[PDB]
């Protein structure tokens, strides 16, 4: 419509913030509908610019701050239905459920003593694993990339050698914003001429408390793993 509203999300530092362009290229501060607040996850949405005019030929920035540490809603991965309403110069609108709400980001790296670790590794919520196998790179650059992407930790090296092969299994740990600790041992082949690694066939073993997020994390990482057309 003249009124075209375009919007995307910007998550700028904790705060997932809503860029909205409602552009009302309308022929007037056309009447506007209705909007509703809610508890969200460890967030709650929390602002609406008050008016409801769709000012003529006019462009507007409508900001929604979201509250990023509260409102539990357990509708995982978000993907929760959201409403913009048809309630005034509007007969309809958008009701939307979100998608676009993923993990790789959330968790931060976190750390451990290795013996205890091992013991723990085994000990943890075993229940998820996903496989590493396939890419576009060596796990040097590739590993770094993945690491940065998820913002997460590989705890320690043994020099055995991530180079000549290595035939290295890398142990990774991370802790998030709402505090889950997640453990990995992924054991991986690694690039190098007619030696081995341009796939893996390494297994990524994922432990996160719910299997459902945990596996999903293994996936998420799987998405993360490579670089291709989303």
């Amino acid at each position: 419509d003249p009124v075209y509203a375009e919007a995307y999300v910007h998550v700028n530092q904790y705060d997932i913030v809503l860029d909205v362009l409602v552009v009302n290229q309308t022929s007037d501060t056309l009447q506007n509908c209705t909007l509703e607040l809610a508890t969200l996850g460890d967030l709650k949405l929390v602002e609406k610019p008050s008016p409801l005019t769709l000012a003529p030929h006019d462009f507007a920035n409508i900001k929604a701050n979201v509250k990023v540490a509260s409102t539990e809603n357990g509708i995982i991965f978000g993907n929760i239905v959201y409403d913009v309403s048809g309630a005034a110069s509007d007969r309809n609108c958008v009701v939307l459920s979100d998608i676009h709400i993923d993990i790789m980001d959330y968790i931060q790296p976190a750390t451990c003593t290795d013996a205890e670790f091992r013991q723990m590794w085994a000990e943890f919520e075993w229940e998820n694993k996903v496989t590493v196998n396939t890419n576009m790179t060596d796990l040097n650059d590739y590993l770094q990339h993945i690491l940065k992407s998820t913002n997460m930790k590989c705890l320690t090296p043994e020099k055995a050698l991530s180079g000549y092969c290595g035939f290295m299994a890398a142990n990774l740990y991370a802790r998030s914003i709402f505090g889950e600790d997640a453990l990995a041992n992924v054991s991986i082949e690694k690039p190098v001429h007619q030696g081995p690694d341009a796939a893996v066939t390494g297994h990524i073993r994922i432990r996160a408390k719910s299997q459902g997020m945990a596996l999903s994390l293994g996936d998420k990482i799987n998405l993360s793993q490579k670089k291709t057309s989303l």
Binding site: D1, Y4, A5, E6, A7, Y8, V9, H10, D19, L21, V81, R91, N92, V94, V95, S97, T228, S229, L230
Partner: protein, 631 residues
């Protein structure tokens, strides 16, 4: 195609589908009224209207509101949306089956299951109407053709049809010839629910479960409290119309008309839904899937969805011809529905299914292919698996039931499917229920060729050959030696830039962009298992992006031309008069506004004039500087 969601529970007497929404509002005699605006597989609200049972559900007529009835006997209208009660009166000695909203002075009609129904003025306070002619326990109350003319179905073993007035019931008339309501060979009985000879129709059939009307018409389609659900037409009034609708085992609680479909859907109690015609009529088949107890069936007056209601519970199933056929003629898109009718180019208000002399999403398609001309199409109909079907090929100047065999933009013949194949002029035709090759220089083509008989894949589906080859395999008109196959894959269609030479590729999920033949230019993927993105010609990448519609890329450019309008998908590009699609609705004709093309060229020549001139000015939407304006 899919039954999106399904748990059997609810013991359901009354039912309605949202003519506007894909809601189902459901009345249980659990005492429950529920609105679930069915779309997001979520109930908005749920009120068990009273301790006692709930029989009734009807529309207000507006957009999203319920008017509801319980054994309270009360007419409530509560808006889900506004979660509030509109004006309130209770009910007589039984529940409320139908309601209608009117407004000289915002004025109201209420239809009821007992005694009377009263029509009330809260403005310049006078009487529009009084209806007596009901007694107790109305199964299915109905607005007629004339909406404010009506029929009712009763557990008092009558049917009432009433005449209303603006000062209570009356009609003036004196011209007719005979009557079908009652006047020649056959006809069914009066019942008693009222006392005026409009027609009280006999609702005895151990009582009548449902009554359903024929808009301008007086044919009724019925649910009945007999195995016999007996069909009568009062727009005929046949003999062997003393039809008892028969299961195998007992009942026929209901059997119903679908507004659109010239059909009857029956449902019953041997664990069944039974399938019936009504276009040429006959018991097609019976289908069994539990619930030896039901009382409602429904097909949406939105027609979105279709569903059947039962005691033990309920099911909703969703239709699609997931992915479905096309042709291009100047600045116009042709579609064949997955679900949904035409939408075969241009638009005007909310959504418009393209109805034209190039009927696309309509016919019983096996395959549709442009026979290029801005004036021709080739079409197979009777679709399906047979020995062979018919193809009637039609002229854009005017299509037909079958166009002229005389005309070669009209020809029809027999043949099962017709299919493209690679190295572009050979074709497949099936004209046996298996491999005929069709090959012509012309693409006004209908050619028959058994040579190239080569099964080892028996009649099925592919289109550059891919009986799930997972390859597009190139050939001539017989050979028993491959020319070659390339490993790449299809939506099971290859996309040509208009006619028959598009190295722009479809893939079912993902689509790949090539220039002609395999040159993988870039490869597309998204992950929504639904929509589209469009090419103007060979590889012009349009992508749809929310309420924003975007050029993925040009020259070295990327751009937002114009912005979308709720979901749309780019299908592809018909000229400058732009065309867009969400799948088959939620549509555009569009004044353009390119972005980018101009731009990387423009840019490449430093040129701004344009942008500027447009005064086009974003850089953020989330961001928007990030094509290369960031870089």
């Amino acid at each position: 195609m899919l039954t999106k969601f399904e748990t059997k529970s609810a013991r359901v007497k009354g039912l309605s589908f949202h003519p506007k929404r894909p809601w189902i509002l459901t009345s249980l005699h659990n005492g429950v009224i529920q609105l679930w605006d069915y779309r997001m597989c979520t109930l908005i609200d749920k009120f068990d209207e009273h301790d006692g049972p709930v029989r009734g559900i009807d529309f207000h007529k507006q957009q999203p509101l319920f008017v509801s009835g319980g054994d309270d006997y009360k007419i409530k209208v509560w808006n889900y949306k506004l979660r509030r009660c509109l004006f309130t009166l209770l009910g007589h000695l039984d529940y409320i089956r139908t309601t209608f909203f009117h407004h000289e002075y915002p004025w109201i009609l209420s239809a009821s299951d007992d005694q009377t129904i009263r029509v009330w003025n809260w403005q310049s306070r006078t009487c529009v109407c009084v209806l007596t002619g009901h007694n107790h326990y109305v199964m299915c109350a109905q607005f007629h053709p004339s909406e404010d003319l009506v029929v009712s179905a009763s557990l008092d073993q009558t049917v009432r049809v009433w005449d209303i007035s603006g000062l209570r019931k009356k009609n003036l008339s004196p011209g007719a010839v005979e009557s079908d309501v009652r006047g020649i060979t056959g006809v069914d009985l009066f019942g008693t629910t009222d006392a005026v000879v409009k027609h009280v129709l006999e609702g005895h059939d151990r009582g009548v479960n449902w009554a359903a009307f024929h808009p301008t018409m007086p044919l009724i389609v019925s649910g009945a409290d007999d195995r016999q659900v007996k069909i009568w037409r009062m727009n005929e009034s046949k003999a062997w119309e003393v039809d008892t609708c028969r299961g195998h085992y007992n009942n026929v609680s209901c059997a119903v008309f679908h507004p659109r479909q010239e059909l009857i859907l029956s449902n019953s109690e041997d664990k069944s839904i039974r399938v019936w015609d009504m276009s040429k009529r006959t018991g097609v088949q019976t289908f069994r899937r539990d619930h030896d107890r039901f009382w409602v069936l429904a097909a949406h007056p939105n027609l979105n969805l279709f569903a059947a209601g039962h005691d033990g519970g309920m099911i909703v199933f969703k239709l699609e011809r997931e992915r479905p056929a096309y042709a291009v003629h100047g600045n116009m898109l042709h579609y064949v529905k997955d679900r949904f009718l035409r939408q075969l180019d241009f638009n005007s208000s909310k959504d418009v299914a393209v109805m034209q002399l190039r009927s696309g999403s309509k016919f019983p398609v096996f395959n549709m292919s442009y026979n290029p001309a801005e004036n021709a199409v080739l079409l197979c109909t009777r679709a399906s698996n047979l020995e062979n079907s018919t193809y009637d090929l039609y002229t854009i100047p005017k299509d037909a039931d079958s166009q002229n065999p005389d005309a070669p933009e009209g020809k029809r013949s027999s043949g099962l499917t017709a299919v493209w194949v690679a190295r572009n002029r050979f074709a497949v035709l099936d004209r046996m229920h298996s491999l005929l090759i069709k090959n012509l220089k012309n693409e006004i083509t209908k050619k028959i060729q058994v040579p190239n008989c080569d099964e080892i894949f028996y009649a099925g589906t592919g289109n550059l050959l891919l009986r799930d080859a997972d390859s597009i395999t190139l050939f001539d008109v017989q050979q028993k030696r491959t020319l070659a196959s390339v490993k790449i894959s299809k939506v099971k269609y290859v996309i040509w830039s208009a006619d028959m030479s598009h190295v722009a590729l479809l893939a079912k999920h993902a689509i790949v962009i090539c220039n002609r033949k395999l040159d993988a230019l870039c490869n597309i993927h998204e992950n929504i298992r639904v929509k589209s993105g469009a090419w103007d010609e060979s590889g012009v990448f349009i992508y749809t992006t929310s309420n924003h519609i975007k050029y993925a890329v040009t020259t070295g450019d990327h751009g937002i031309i114009r912005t979308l309008d709720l979901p749309i998908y780019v299908t592809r590009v018909k000229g400058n008069n732009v065309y867009c699609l969400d799948r088959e609705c939620r549509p555009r004709v569009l004044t353009i506004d390119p972005t980018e093309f101009k731009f990387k060229l423009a840019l490449i020549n430093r040129k701004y004039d344009e942008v500027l001139h447009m005064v086009r000015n974003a850089k953020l939407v989330g961001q928007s500087i990030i094509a290369y304006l960031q870089k």
